[PDB]
Amino acid sequence: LSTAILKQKNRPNRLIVDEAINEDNSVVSLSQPKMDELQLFRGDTVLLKGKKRREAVCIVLSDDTCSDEKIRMNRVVRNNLRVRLGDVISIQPCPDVKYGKRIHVLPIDDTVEGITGNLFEVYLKPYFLEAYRPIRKGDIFLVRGGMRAVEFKVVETDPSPYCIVAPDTVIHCEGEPIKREDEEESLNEVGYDDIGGCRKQLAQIKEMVELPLRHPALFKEIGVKPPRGILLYGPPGTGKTLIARAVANETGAFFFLINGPEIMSKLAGESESNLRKAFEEAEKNAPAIIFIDELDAIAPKREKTHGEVERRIVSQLLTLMDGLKQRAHVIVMAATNRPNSIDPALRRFGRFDREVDIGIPDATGRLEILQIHTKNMKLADDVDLEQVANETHGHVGADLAALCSEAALQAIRKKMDLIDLEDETIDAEVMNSLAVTMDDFRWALSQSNPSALRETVVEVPQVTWEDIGGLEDVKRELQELVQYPVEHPDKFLKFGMTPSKGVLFYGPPGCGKTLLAKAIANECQANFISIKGPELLTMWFGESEANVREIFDKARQAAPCVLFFDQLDSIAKARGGNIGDGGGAADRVINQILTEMDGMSTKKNVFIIGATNRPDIIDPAILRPGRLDQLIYIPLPDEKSRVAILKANLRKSPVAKDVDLEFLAKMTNGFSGADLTEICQRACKLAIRESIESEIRRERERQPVPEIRRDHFEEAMRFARRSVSDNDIRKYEMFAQTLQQSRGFGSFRFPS
Amino acid sequence: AFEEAEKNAPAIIFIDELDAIAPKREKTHGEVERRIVSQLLTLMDGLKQRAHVIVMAATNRPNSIDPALRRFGRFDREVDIGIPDATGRLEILQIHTKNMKLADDVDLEQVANETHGHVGADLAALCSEAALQAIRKKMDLIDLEDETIDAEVMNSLAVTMDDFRWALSQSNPSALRETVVEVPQVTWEDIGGLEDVKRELQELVQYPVEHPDKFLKFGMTPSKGVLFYGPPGCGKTLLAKAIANECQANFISIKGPELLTMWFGESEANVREIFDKARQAAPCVLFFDQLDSIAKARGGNIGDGGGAADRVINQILTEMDGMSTKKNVFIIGATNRPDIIDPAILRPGRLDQLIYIPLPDEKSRVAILKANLRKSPVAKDVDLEFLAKMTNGFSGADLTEICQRACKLAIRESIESEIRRERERQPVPEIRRDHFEEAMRFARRSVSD
Amino acid sequence: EIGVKPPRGILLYGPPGTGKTLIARAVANETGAFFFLINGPEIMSKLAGESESNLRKAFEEAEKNAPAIIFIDELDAIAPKREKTHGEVERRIVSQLLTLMDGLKQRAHVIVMAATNRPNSIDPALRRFGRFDREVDIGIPDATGRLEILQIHTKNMKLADDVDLEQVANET
């Protein structure tokens, strides 16, 4: 249905592009059976449909090596048609070819340099003498000879555009040589093939702009008018302006560009004059496309706007789009970042009827984007874009381009010892050897961060799972929670159940909640957003809920993502307990959080994790399943857990073999992990003191401490203290036992 | 322009977007625009003496028109072009579809009945989308890149009732376009228990739109206000989602605090705007999730804070009184803290009907457990009734998380078996009893006594 | 040869006094390319459409002379978040800048630099890859870094022998 327009349907006339081993610039060779199917004779001029609205005519030839589904074309033909190897183009004989009455040909400015003889007699005179070579306007053909072979472009071919060169034809090279940068820019043109992902959106745009122009007879027959308005809205970097550029490059109809703020002028009423001139100029050339970049710049809400001129401009846009005199085959496209900021009357059927949602690509989409981007660049053999696509979690498509650029820069960094910056030129062997490798992509991935999350970036202490001692069950639960919905969605669809997306950590201070959060941030394969407790709150009325909504929206954009609240009890507390708190600002914030986690909006892959010291004061509506689905209790470590903690802290620090951590873990009862870390730090400080004293003694005698020993740990344990009192443990156990009594059965069993 | 009207009599002057040149002079910050307004007033005061010239003006927002232009003697007669009704929509479809190549299977009465708030431009959008889909059907025969089209395809082109059904599925009113959010697909059979509540909601949504004549006969106004209060996780938002999905009435869903803005006067403007766009698409359902955020006991903000929330609640009360009984606007509010709600909004005439969603009972828990697993394969040896008996005070969300924990355990077992297989090289088609065992061990009651 | 476009965006952010404007001066003096200075407050004007005209004129002047470097000093003042700002002219200027950096017609050889004390004030659209490719953090110097700064500063000074710059670097 919708995807059908992107399908080629494997038409017999369309054929595979293949290399031309022997065919010259002006001829093509195909299989003789293909002539049999196409009813073509040798020497017939054939018109080849090419991308970016480029067409070239060549002399057909019979070749056995050319495959039936393939066509052999020289590099010149591919350049003129803007077609790459392996693409699919059709062949059609040129209709009613007339011999060229006159030809104007222009060289390229880079090749003409160093050519001692004049180009016409050296290149044009022998090449075109009895050539009988078909050419096209805008085609560049390479001519051998001279100190460098010269590419020649026939800017004007007469008769336009169907012609054959003959010896009697007048040949001149007068005029400025065609700029090589112009040639590259004509090569660097974006087409519909360039857009990656969002295939359905591209199909809808093709139906909007390409179908009416190609086949107006269909809509004339049915007696309907095709849509005349397209709004492309989405987060920054999805590719709206890229689609606009592709449509501009590959539509025969006229293209008119309007930048939003560019309309504004100092004189009174001059903006309306500019808009009227733009629309009238579009109407002058009948089938035309108007692209209004940044529509939200010139079309704010009329009720919201406080400026008179802006309201008059939006009214002028409304009247131009719809009025007494309706438009005559004029398509208006606008790309906006904020679709809600547009005036409501503009979003009606008359003016902007079709809204196209350019959204965040999924994994296969960003794989396709990576393939399209990396087709041009040089790559090694070990590169594997599937892994890179899997790693790039929340990236949008501009971020993928950033990743490619960073990897290329790293690759060039690697060859810096051979290269000299001061040198004017680099050795050709270096550029031949220089290429992108998988190491470059891995390093760029390490450096890469989504553009949406750039504001919420926090440096993390680089903790790994092995640094946390104990809590093995909690570690496995966290890894399963973050992994299963992402890596294995098919299982959940098979069982037809949505995953759980909430975890709350509650326990005595120093037990390992923020440590687990650091481990998840460093290790797990999902974007991490860290929110301190009260940083969302703001003086102004209604700003706090705006911040909460904005941060949840950022989490949804970068899905899969993890949202961590370090101190949940600060931001979410039992409602109605505030004598002040502004105009119930705390309660409104809590309500906003409640509606964000579990609301009528469809659930997306965002996991909310919270850590709290007092879980009792937390509002009951938060703890209801569907918000903070699972409550995990982080207890004081046991003797085995204490052994694991003491091992984990001391792995990097050199410690004497006689020191037995099991005895420390045996006596230390009720100590938190923080207390054990403090004991180890005190032992380290005592060792530092001893080493410094020995160094001072050596300096004095001028006028040791290889590892921490048993006496250091003895003194540290003398200084050690038990952080968490018994009563706090009692209140946490009271909360836990209330929950367990709510469970009501330590053991459960089905009757059999 | 007025002189040219005088030159050729009779003359008609049409002013399109009158609000563009006729804003309230006090709201205007420029002298030239004020002079334009006064000049319009003076030219039309002179118009009063003239013989054969009549001026008509069209505006989207009548309020923005300067009050003098609405004064007696100025635009004395004012026509409200209301949204079309069902017969009006059918007439619009008949007018617009006479040109199109409609098939015989299409009947326009069903299409007219299906749409709720379409104002006529949406009907043209519906027809154009259906024609586009019809093109897509024949678009496999003849491709875009093909330069010509078979005449047989041209004859074969037709608009079927399937295309209109597709367009109706895709259709959305223009007013709702600003306030559309994706809602998970929920039906009534998906919800477990609360059969009486389902019936009541269906009746209150269906009766005024379907049968106003009965209420007119018996002389009672329909009750437009419904309040949901109950323990968290009992299914208020689920009922709202089901209403949004199946009901043949437009749905506007707004979070509580999202209306408030820092700028002076913007919050009341947002309240008026949301109620206006609710009235425009009647019959429409207006849902205030987390009502306790907006509506709070009066004087608390006045005592502490700015006090603009008081103006917000006053504006909501003023608007919710303002709408007429004939207008088909229904207001649903869900809160889990009914005590903190301002008692003024509970007063009869506003949100007069109250519904208490209880913590589910025994058979209700059985129904909930069945509903959660209607799509999930489960071994027959598992007895849901026993879970219902054992889980006395559990809410619906607790039963759901027990089922989801069982699913997670099944997934863990399947994954470990798979990785064992790949390790050997180089299970659980349905959830069993032991998964539910471990889920019940992890289970806990969400709502305290 | 590698097949990628060079990065065209630089953002320098750090606490005041770290040396961002000094880096801009060094780049302007040390490179063989056109340099155009843009100060955030100076572009905007009370007239309607004058600020947009100033931005377009500056980018066009940079476009004419290639390669070009544009340094936008105090970008935070000129480019606030569009959601937060209420003034219409500021939104128009931000949108014009967004279009100028990356639009349907893209800059060929213009490399744009900016210095700001608070990077978070900048609009999230500008921080995208296409507009400002990478953000460079000019941070608090370390002990060795500030020793290096002291050596650079005191080169032009006349010093006596007793001056010990390592001690001064340690104390500060």
Ligand SMILES: Nc1ncnc2c1ncn2[C@@H]1O[C@H](COP(=O)(O)OP(=O)(O)OP(=O)(O)O)[C@@H](O)[C@H]1O
């Ligand atoms: N789908 C895509 N396929 C290929 N490249 C893409 C795609 N999406 C984005 N890009 C790349 O990202 C950039 C496109 O950014 P673009 O100008 O389209 O953004 P935008 O949506 O207009 O942003 P803004 O909101 O700032 O207006 C280019 O560098 C392009 O190569």
Ligand SMILES: Nc1ncnc2c1ncn2[C@@H]1O[C@H](COP(=O)(O)OP(=O)(O)OP(=O)(O)O)[C@@H](O)[C@H]1O
């Ligand atoms: N299981 C553990 N393994 C290793 N170190 C641990 C462990 N538990 C705690 N620590 C130590 O505790 C310190 C960090 O404590 P953490 O941030 O986890 O506290 P918390 O219990 O979340 O408390 P708070 O509520 O105060 O944030 C570090 O010194 C860390 O080494």
Ligand SMILES: Nc1ncnc2c1ncn2[C@@H]1O[C@H](COP(=O)(O)OP(=O)(O)OP(=O)(O)O)[C@@H](O)[C@H]1O
């Ligand atoms: N009757 C029910 N049938 C099926 N599922 C239910 C039922 N009641 C609750 N649930 C489950 O619980 C969740 C629905 O909770 P809902 O949003 O309706 O709660 P609420 O009453 O609005 O509470 P809150 O005060 O937390 O907003 C879903 O996960 C749904 O599967």
Ligand SMILES: Nc1ncnc2c1ncn2[C@@H]1O[C@H](COP(=O)(O)OP(=O)(O)OP(=O)(O)O)[C@@H](O)[C@H]1O
């Ligand atoms: N790294 C450095 N090395 C040498 N001198 C420095 C360095 N950083 C700063 N200075 C000196 O301090 C002066 C002030 O620094 P500069 O004006 O560059 O700061 P800035 O970060 O741009 O400040 P602002 O926030 O005011 O724009 C410089 O002109 C220079 O003399």
Ligand SMILES: [Mg+2]
């Ligand atoms: Mg853009």
Ligand SMILES: [Mg+2]
């Ligand atoms: Mg913490």
Ligand SMILES: [Mg+2]
């Ligand atoms: Mg709810």
Ligand SMILES: [Mg+2]
């Ligand atoms: Mg400075």
